[PDB]
């Protein structure tokens, strides 16, 4: 492949991280860090190790170098809704989903 | 305090319309390689003139 580097669960929602990794896409690879390392919150750090991966992973599987690359595809898919139960008052329902999300990010070239 | 039909996917994002973060517009500092927050100076060691914390 043109080097990949997924996560797997990691725990933190679909929409929550579909956010962050929208800034990444198009340009990037060098811009990888800069625009994560600053842009705040949590979702946007569980990308800044799947990018350091998807780079060393292009210095192994792929012989490509740390300045090229592109980041031609990212998407966050819906990981298993990790379920449990909450109290409340009387009890009724506490669906409470601890929701999760796989990561996959891919860098290649022009 | 409840709806009656189901707020379709179509509308799913017609709130979501606005969010899709925006990121930066950063600059460097005369002394770090290309770091610098938008207001705090050299991350690279930490300073602006000189002895900000522990430097050179």
């Amino acid at each position: 492949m043109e080097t990949i580097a997924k996560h797997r669960h990691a725990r933190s929602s679909a929409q929550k991280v579909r956010l962050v990794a929208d800034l990444i896409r198009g340009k990037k690879v060098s811009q990888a860090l800069d625009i994560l390392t600053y842009t705040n919150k949590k979702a946007a750090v569980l990308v800044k190790k799947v990018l350091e991966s998807a780079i060393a992973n292009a210095e192994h599987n792929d012989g490509a170098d740390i300045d090229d690359l592109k980041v031609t595809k990212i998407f966050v898919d819906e990981g298993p809704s990790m379920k449990r139960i909450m109290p409340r008052a009387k009890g009724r329902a506490d669906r409470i989903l601890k929701r999760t999300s796989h990561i996959t990010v891919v860098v290649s070239d022009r | 305090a409840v709806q009656q039909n189901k707020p379709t996917r179509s509308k799913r994002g017609m709130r979501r319309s606005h969010d899709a973060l925006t990121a930066v517009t950063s600059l460097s500092v005369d002394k770090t390689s290309g770091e610098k927050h938008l207001r705090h100076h050299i991350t690279a060691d930490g300073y602006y003139r000189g002895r900000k914390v522990i430097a050179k």
Binding site: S30, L33, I66, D67 | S33, G34
Partner: peptide, 16 residues
């Protein structure tokens, strides 16, 4: 060392 190959180096050996 090109400021990303630097962000590497400086750390890949703040390991060794």
């Amino acid at each position: 060392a090109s400021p990303l190959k630097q962000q590497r180096i400086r750390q890949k050996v703040e390991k060794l």
